[PDB]
Amino acid sequence: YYTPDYETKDTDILAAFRMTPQPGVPPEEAGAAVAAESSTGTWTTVWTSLDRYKGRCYDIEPVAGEENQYIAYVAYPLDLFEEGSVTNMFTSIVGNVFGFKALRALRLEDLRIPPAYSKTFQGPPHGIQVERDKLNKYGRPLLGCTIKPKLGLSAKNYGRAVYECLRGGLDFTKDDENVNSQPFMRWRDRFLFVAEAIFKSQAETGEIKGHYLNATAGTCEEMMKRAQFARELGMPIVMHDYLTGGFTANTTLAHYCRDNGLLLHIHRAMHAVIDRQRNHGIHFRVLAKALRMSGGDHIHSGTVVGKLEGEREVTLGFVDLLRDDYIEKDRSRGIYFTQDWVSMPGVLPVASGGIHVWHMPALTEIFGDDSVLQFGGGTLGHPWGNAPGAVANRVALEACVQARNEGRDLAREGNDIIREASKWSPELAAACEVWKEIK
């Protein structure tokens, strides 16, 4: 298998994993066994012309800093995959490779998809440029919030909190991941009360508002029923969970949204079981590429306002993969291959966690005005209530955007901008007394 003189073609799928061979196994022998245990399962021409229907290792590097670590490269032919199927791609590259005993740990890192294979997929339903035109919002990042705790509330009372937050100045409102249909609140009458509050808040401010409605179900017949009822009421956006529902069900929902004009929001649940350890699993940057091809408009990515050097580059690395059109090779940021998306729409990233007013300058400078910021306890915890709480967040945001368009460093001048702003807004003042400043 190992063909160090091999030259990849323009229609080949490439992969790269790291390996931890057992004591005794030579490195050059282990690499060739991974390429075979992924395709045919043999090193001889006894059962055979087949020849071209196999994989091959063409490169091996030693990892610096650890003696027992290597990087391998494998190439696959194009005719081994079914067009338009994401399930087939995973079941072929990785169907049985982590059960190999001669190793101790394995981890997939990156993949290169040639343009001759990406053209058979549909991609995101709308994208970034099209979505901004439907909402008529330009210049700054969007805002949102989620009713997190509570639980056990009635349908009437659930719609009360939605109306208060939207009237304050927010843009979106979320739901809870583990809320589909339960004895204390059924799904049909929760949809009715939510849609009533959206129309009322749209007549006082004259701006477009929305709310993510969960559409996960146990069967495909039931999942499609909840999506059609959201179109009769004229709702603009829905929500799905693509890691516990499966890839087959996610592709069906993406096609429906494109044919009816709906926006899709994606949540990543259960992901921590796969991509937390440093020596076993599949890196998150691979699952992000599969989501772009399958379909989606938003995705969760996590905050980095709490990281340091070495980090904050891996996360910044795969943010470019979700928005750009041509990404060059860069090993310092965790990119092993050059990728071209031949004019495919991008995906908007979402940042969340425990954040507050004193974090405004940090998030704006890093992500830019191309993301969505979500708040949890930083909105419902205001001493005056829900509606005054949403006023504080809006004010702070506008301040940062304005300063930036005057040549004022947001990395240094930050606590100052917030303070001078709490000198003409009583709501912000109160909030600045509950939460503490940032060194």
Partner 1 sequence: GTKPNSLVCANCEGEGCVACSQCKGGGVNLIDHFNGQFKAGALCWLCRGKKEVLCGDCNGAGFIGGFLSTFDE
**Residue 56 makes contact with partner 1 by CB under 8 A:** no
Q: Which of 36, 161, 249, 401 binds a second copy (CB under 8 A)?
A: 249
Residue with tokens 């910044």: 316
The 10 Å Cβ neighbour count of residue 231 is: 14
Q: Cite the active site residues.
A: 148, 267
**Residue 246 makes contact with a second copy by CB under 8 A:** yes
CB of 436 to a second copy, least distance (A): 19
Say if residues 21 and 81 touch (Cβ distance below 8 Å): no
**Residue 36 makes contact with partner 1 by CB under 8 A:** yes
Residues 279-338 that bind a second copy (CB under 8 A): 280-282
**Residue 433 makes contact with partner 1 by CB under 8 A:** yes
What gap in Å lies between CA 402 and CA 46, rounded to an integer? 72
Residue with tokens 């992500």: 367
Rama region for 130: left / alpha / beta (φ>0; ψ in -120 to 50; rest): alpha
Residue 173 or 374 having the CB closest to partner 1: 374
Residue with tokens 């915890």: 381
Site string for a second copy, 30-59 (x = CB under 8 A): ----------xxx----x-xx--x------
81 binds, among partner 1, a second copy, none (CB under 5 to 8 A by kind): a second copy
Nearest partner of 104 among 66, 76, 54, 139, judged by Cα: 66
Residue 15 or 428 having the CB closest to a second copy: 15
- Six-digit token string for 139: 């210049």
What gap in Å lies between CA 18 and CA 277, rounded to an integer? 13
CB of 241 to partner 1, least distance (A): 16
What gap in Å lies between CA 228 and CA 259, rounded to an integer? 12
Q: Read off the amino acid at residue 361.
A: P
Give how many residues touch partner 1 by CB under 8 A: 46
**Residue 78 makes contact with a second copy by CB under 8 A:** yes
Residues 369-408 that bind partner 1 (CB under 8 A): 376-378, 381, 383-384
Residues 380-409 that bind a second copy (CB under 8 A): none
Q: Which of 25, 63, 151, 208 binds a second copy (CB under 8 A)?
A: 151
SS (H, E, C) 185-214: ECHHHHHHHHHHHHHHHHHHHCCCCCCCEE
**Residue 130 makes contact with a second copy by CB under 8 A:** yes
Q: Which of 112, 137, 140, 148 binds a second copy (CB under 8 A)?
A: 148
Element (H, E) at 73: strand 70-76
